[PDB]
Design a protein around this motif. Structure first.
Motif, short mmCIF file in Angstrom:
data_model
loop_
_atom_site.label_atom_id
_atom_site.label_comp_id
_atom_site.label_asym_id
_atom_site.label_seq_id
_atom_site.Cartn_x
_atom_site.Cartn_y
_atom_site.Cartn_z
N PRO C 27 50.49 -46.71 4.34
CA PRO C 27 51.19 -45.68 3.56
C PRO C 27 51.63 -44.51 4.43
O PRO C 27 51.04 -44.29 5.48
CB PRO C 27 50.13 -45.25 2.53
CG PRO C 27 48.83 -45.58 3.18
CD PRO C 27 49.08 -46.83 3.95
N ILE C 28 52.66 -43.79 3.99
CA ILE C 28 53.24 -42.69 4.79
C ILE C 28 52.52 -41.37 4.55
O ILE C 28 52.52 -40.84 3.44
CB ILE C 28 54.72 -42.50 4.48
CG1 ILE C 28 55.46 -43.84 4.61
CG2 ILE C 28 55.34 -41.45 5.41
CD1 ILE C 28 56.94 -43.78 4.15
N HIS C 29 51.90 -40.84 5.59
CA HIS C 29 51.10 -39.64 5.45
C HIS C 29 51.95 -38.39 5.62
O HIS C 29 52.19 -37.96 6.71
CB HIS C 29 49.95 -39.67 6.44
CG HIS C 29 48.94 -40.71 6.12
ND1 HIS C 29 47.77 -40.44 5.44
CD2 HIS C 29 48.95 -42.05 6.33
CE1 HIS C 29 47.09 -41.56 5.27
NE2 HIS C 29 47.78 -42.55 5.80
N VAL C 30 52.42 -37.82 4.51
CA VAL C 30 53.31 -36.65 4.58
C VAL C 30 52.57 -35.32 4.53
O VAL C 30 53.13 -34.28 4.89
CB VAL C 30 54.36 -36.70 3.45
CG1 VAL C 30 55.25 -37.95 3.61
CG2 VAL C 30 53.67 -36.71 2.10
N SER C 31 51.31 -35.35 4.11
CA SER C 31 50.55 -34.11 3.91
C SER C 31 50.42 -33.30 5.19
O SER C 31 50.09 -33.84 6.23
CB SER C 31 49.16 -34.41 3.36
OG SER C 31 48.52 -33.21 2.95
N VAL C 201 67.23 -42.09 13.34
CA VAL C 201 66.10 -41.19 13.52
C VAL C 201 66.01 -40.75 14.98
O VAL C 201 66.27 -41.53 15.89
CB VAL C 201 64.76 -41.86 13.08
CG1 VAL C 201 64.47 -43.08 13.92
CG2 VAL C 201 63.60 -40.87 13.16
N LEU C 202 65.64 -39.50 15.19
CA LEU C 202 65.43 -38.97 16.53
C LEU C 202 63.95 -39.04 16.85
O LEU C 202 63.10 -38.70 16.01
CB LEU C 202 65.88 -37.52 16.64
CG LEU C 202 67.33 -37.09 16.47
CD1 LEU C 202 67.41 -35.58 16.63
CD2 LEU C 202 68.25 -37.77 17.48
N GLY C 229 58.33 -35.52 12.37
CA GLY C 229 57.85 -35.65 11.01
C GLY C 229 57.29 -37.04 10.71
O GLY C 229 57.60 -38.02 11.40
N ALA C 230 56.46 -37.14 9.68
CA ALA C 230 55.84 -38.41 9.32
C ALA C 230 56.87 -39.46 8.87
O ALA C 230 56.73 -40.66 9.15
CB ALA C 230 54.81 -38.21 8.23
N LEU C 231 57.87 -39.01 8.13
CA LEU C 231 58.90 -39.93 7.69
C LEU C 231 59.69 -40.47 8.90
O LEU C 231 60.05 -41.65 8.95
CB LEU C 231 59.84 -39.25 6.68
CG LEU C 231 59.21 -39.03 5.29
CD1 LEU C 231 60.01 -38.00 4.50
CD2 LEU C 231 59.17 -40.35 4.53
N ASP C 232 59.95 -39.61 9.87
CA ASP C 232 60.62 -40.05 11.08
C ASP C 232 59.79 -41.09 11.82
O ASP C 232 60.32 -42.11 12.28
CB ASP C 232 60.91 -38.85 11.98
CG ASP C 232 61.59 -37.74 11.22
OD1 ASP C 232 60.86 -36.95 10.58
OD2 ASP C 232 62.83 -37.69 11.22
N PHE C 234 57.72 -43.07 10.52
CA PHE C 234 57.80 -44.29 9.73
C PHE C 234 59.06 -45.10 10.10
O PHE C 234 58.98 -46.32 10.29
CB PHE C 234 57.79 -43.98 8.23
CG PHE C 234 58.16 -45.17 7.38
CD1 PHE C 234 57.24 -46.18 7.14
CD2 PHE C 234 59.43 -45.28 6.85
CE1 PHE C 234 57.60 -47.29 6.36
CE2 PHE C 234 59.79 -46.37 6.08
CZ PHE C 234 58.88 -47.37 5.84
N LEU C 235 60.20 -44.41 10.22
CA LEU C 235 61.44 -45.11 10.56
C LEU C 235 61.41 -45.68 12.00
O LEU C 235 61.91 -46.77 12.23
CB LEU C 235 62.64 -44.18 10.39
CG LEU C 235 62.96 -43.77 8.96
CD1 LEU C 235 64.03 -42.70 8.98
CD2 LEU C 235 63.39 -44.99 8.15
N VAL C 236 60.83 -44.93 12.94
CA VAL C 236 60.68 -45.45 14.29
C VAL C 236 59.78 -46.70 14.28
O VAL C 236 60.12 -47.73 14.88
CB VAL C 236 60.08 -44.41 15.26
CG1 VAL C 236 59.83 -45.04 16.64
CG2 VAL C 236 61.00 -43.20 15.40
N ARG C 238 59.12 -48.75 11.85
CA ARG C 238 59.74 -49.84 11.12
C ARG C 238 60.78 -50.52 12.01
O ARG C 238 60.84 -51.74 12.08
CB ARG C 238 60.38 -49.33 9.82
CG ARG C 238 60.90 -50.42 8.87
CD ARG C 238 61.71 -49.80 7.74
NE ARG C 238 61.83 -50.62 6.55
CZ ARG C 238 62.94 -51.24 6.16
NH1 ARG C 238 64.05 -51.14 6.88
NH2 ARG C 238 62.94 -51.96 5.04
#
Lengths: 366, 360, 365, 362
Positions: C27-31, C201-202, C229-232, C234-236, C238
């Motif tokens: 899961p993506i940890h955004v906190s 994504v950078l 960032g956490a979402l970034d 995630f994209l790297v 993936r």
């Protein structure tokens, strides 16, 4: 969330502890599948997902209900409920959203009987619920776009005498202003796309209810029909939900200001707003809504609606409602284009500065 | 554009002003009417969703595609178009069939591997023939061109569930079918992190009906989900070819193991419909099943250290399941039949894991 | 990842299924913050984040290294390494305009930057004779002329002089080149390019083995706050799943395009590590498993700006390594031995015949 | 944004129309690179330099302070690091923390860092007497004792000496304090805190007016590569819509909690800009429209770690400004007994009861 008041539940309902790491904001569960040997509750995402469940827990908590189910959209929530109605059975609805009518048309082609009625009068109520094989009474209150309101407690009692289930589309009011289950209905229906998510950047629906057999049926349909929302979508709805009461309270306060501007305008005819004393069902409003809401409609007398629509510089001319951006539409030209005059205008009040919105509306009416 | 080029550039609509190579994600639910006049509301129209649909349609050289919240939702939409009193002939989806049956749709099951076909299509008021090929979990194959010709004689529509093969390996519309059905959740998105469905087809009246149902039933995917499905779609041919290559390696491993019985794979020379396989699949796919003879399936399942024991398929992570215990827990499916979904891990690592599990 | 080969580590590196729920995809940890009483390793997002850590574990695994640290961009990764060089100390480099922007910044803080020819033994000897040598900074193959530097040899010589060696491995990726196995101390990446691979994504990365380096790197990242960032992340992560599949395809297609370039009457010099006539081909055979997906060439057919206008499949734009094929003219673009008519190609994963046809149409020989 | 009042700018600042499709919420620009030939005016070349989603957030932030420029960063620390990079060797920074982490770095680069008491005319004069003074670095209200510095006065005096003034405005937010209107040159933010407000994204920002500063700031950000992602910018921007609603609520609840604290037998000093007895009350009233959502107090009831364990609604953890209420003990985490509260938007009576229960024990 026992002991949590409403605004606290907005922040902490379903905010499940992260084991090990202790995240304050729950992580976003995107995985479609699960290792069986590592658990045994989670098998497949269309059926089970922690991020979805957290949102459902929050929504249920907002109405002190045991159950909630979220969907890919408000229409999907509605379709799910309608699927439980059998061919030959009857649905009674208020005569006053085009979306639900599209669904009603679909349901009719499957053999569901749809009856439209006036549920604001004892006579109208009595006649409607006299329909044979009555399975579901479908109340939208306040209604779209004329904002008439139906006595949920009264209709529910009368419907329950006849063995029917009652659903309230609570989208306009939101659970901040109106609590249908507490009023006696069996189901609260939402397009969470509107004020619940509140930022106009995600589609979603929800059903909130108390009956366990209904729960099993609802989840069964959602699983089989596959009208499930994505985890990222649930994350955005849940995040918007934090500020729901702050947002609604602001929109209602501004709506009241705008209504006064409209009533004072020489080019406005009827003004429809539940908070007005002259509202045909105001006593009911006072009994079942904590505040009169953020939606206003009115008849524009100054010419073609499109001329009015073109003059707004702050209101956005577009469909939907409940969001942070104020919206204006003309139902005849837009949502209801497929008692709604050609010049009826509907306002959805956002959270902008009330004086800016007041000045924009005033300039527009000219 | 050739296929692999369409994967990358299909539906890749240039951004006005800014020139983004990757199209921006359109999350907005609503649109300003005065600033345009095609986009009114997100449930009906969304550029990110449309770009994905354009790509999928392009992969089959078809004029239309429609995506959904899930594969089940795509299937439900298709089934909604069958009227009560009409008949569907078919080779979950059965859960959907129960729903359709209780609303007055006649569902008939038939063997579509035999010219069973004649008997099946003899059904009155035949509206839809619903084919999966290769089938789950025994990987039998149905001659789509043959069934479609016979079904079109009788005025019926043909749909193929093309999830197992993907458009990389099998082209149902080209074989004569009217609709290709997908759970994009599987190999199309390919990374086990988004739900989705799709229909790809050519008929304009169907298009109208499908979209009308989707808008009204509201079984639309979110824009972020469409973004993830589209992003995964770039590598679809790279992934699938890798998965097929490895599956072949695993099949040789299975055939040599003393605790393996029947092996089910469209690529085997002895396959009962191998001629049909060579005719309609460009390669035999990444799904393999086999009878485990070493005991209860759990004895085998507990020993994997690289394969994941879980349902679904087609993604980058290799998966293993026992249909009898898992997907088919509620037809020739033994209690010890095992199904493998091959991922993109190193083939030697996967072969070694399988062998260790089988050996003990 | 013990016992996992490279392609397996791409899928399962840093992937420990979720306790309780068993998610296959973590899961993506955004906190940004953490409850202290519910654990005690996680305090604040700028310092700690599980999604970021999983990506780091993966990248580390790809090079059999103990450590990796990811950043907001390749530039930030580079900036961090440069921050560890003290005023008065010297950096010797082969280089990217970005890295030159940073070298200029470092110089204005008192770092001595010496540029050298590291492809010849005299040039190598001359460079490493610099006093207070702290860091040898190697890009190979180089941008945009694709010369290559013998990492093993330079590392040997630099370690004799007590210096740290970093290799910018972005062009090659860990699929094709393993700087740490060759003797370098640090692999530097813009994950923005082929590692993430989808131009959406950078990110940056450092991969290395020294624990004292790890401490210094993490301390700077926390203080400077150049965290992704956490979402970034995630994209790297993936994108990283398909890295070997993507790279192998890009390389195969590049070889085809190089042959097309060699056959064109409006093409002069062709620069590619895979060519037999390449000035450092022997080093290429020794340290790269395949010659990469970047090609440059001198266009002889007319103004470069017109050539760029004629591509219909290649995108005219900067960056590289992604699924979309890209073309640029350094003199007009990134660098606005580099002629005005030098063209650089970054090969994506489109059909090779489509790309070859687009190239030929553009060349209009 | 001309003619838009503050709360309107929160919703509509930088909300750039989408050509053709007309999206109300701008789409998220995730692309790292751009086709050069697809642009009427060549403005977007590469994501580390240019990105429409990032720029929309910057336009909004700039608009909130009626300023011409804003630049956002991967974090508040990166924003601070960027500003500090502009101080040249031999020059001096005078300051009122992770910023102290950064100050140590600046010291190792040849920057002279001087700490001073900026609450007195004597302290200010002494401070500003430093040779080669380039930058005055103000945090107000301060963390964690919430003392306040007169921005207008310090700015006036510092500009006499030719120095730049920055105010870290994270605690107050632009809803409550406008450093540029008070005379400072730069407003500095950790947007991680109340600006984004939902504790789910990291970010920093600088807001300022000088065009030469702008060029230098953008140059550093591009070169150092401390840029935020587009998805992060989206979340910060999304959070920003409700900034005034959230802050006004947090402030109202903070006031309620201060009263509970003042009534507690196990609480000593209570630190809050809104208290009449506050040593800089005149300055507070002059430069803050409301006294903020952070409160600190001296706990007298025993070990702080025990108190922290007793909260059931407040979260024990660092950071601040988000919708979730937070509590920490600076000595243990970020006097030995000082507690800092960051008030969220939960029901004020729930929060008061949790605090009272924690203070009481049992």
């Amino acid at each position: 969330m026992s002991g949590m008041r409403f605004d606290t539940r907005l922040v902490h309902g379903g905010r499940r502890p992260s084991a090990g790491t202790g995240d304050v904001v729950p992580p976003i569960h995107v995985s479609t599948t699960y290792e069986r040997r590592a658990q045994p509750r989670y098998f497949y995402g269309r059926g089970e997902n922690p991020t979805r469940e957290e949102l459902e827990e929050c929504l249920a908590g907002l109405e002190r209900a045991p159950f909630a189910t979220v969907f890919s959209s408000g229409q999907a929530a509605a379709a799910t409920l309608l699927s439980l109605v059998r061919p030959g059975q009857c649905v009674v609805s208020t005569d006053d959203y085009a979306g639900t009518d599209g669904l009603f048309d679909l349901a009719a082609r499957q053999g569901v009987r749809v009856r439209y009625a006036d549920l604001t009068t004892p006579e109208g109520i009595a006649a409607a619920l006299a329909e044979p094989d009555l399975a579901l009474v479908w109340i939208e209150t306040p209604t779209n776009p004329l904002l008439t309101v139906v006595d949920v407690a009264e209709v529910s009692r009368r419907a329950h005498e006849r063995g029917a289930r009652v659903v309230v589309d609570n989208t306009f009011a939101s659970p901040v202003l109106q609590q249908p289950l507490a009023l006696g209905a069996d189901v609260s229906l939402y397009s969470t796309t509107k004020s619940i998510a509140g930022h106009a950047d995600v589609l979603g629906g929800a059903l909130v209810y108390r009956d366990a057999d209904l729960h099993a049926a609802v989840r069964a349909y959602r699983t089989t029909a596959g009208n499930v929302p994505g985890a990222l979508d649930c994350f955005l709805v849940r995040r918007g939900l934090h500020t729901l009461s702050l947002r609604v309270h602001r929109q209602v306060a501004t709506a009241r200001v705008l209504v006064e501007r409209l009533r004072a305008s020489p080019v406005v005819g009827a003004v429809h707003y539940p908070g007005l004393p002259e509202h045909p069902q105001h006593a009911v409003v006072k009994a079942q809504m904590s505040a009169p809401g953020a939606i206003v409609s009115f008849d524009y007398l100054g010419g073609p609606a499109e001329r009015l629509l073109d003059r707004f510089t702050l209101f956005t001319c577009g469909v939907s409602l409940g969001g942070v951006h104020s919206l204006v539409e003309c139902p005849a030209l837009m949502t209801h284009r497929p008692g709604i005059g050609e010049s009826l205008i509907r306002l959805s009040v956002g959270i902008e500065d009330p004086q800016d919105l007041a000045e924009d509306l005033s300039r527009a009416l000219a």
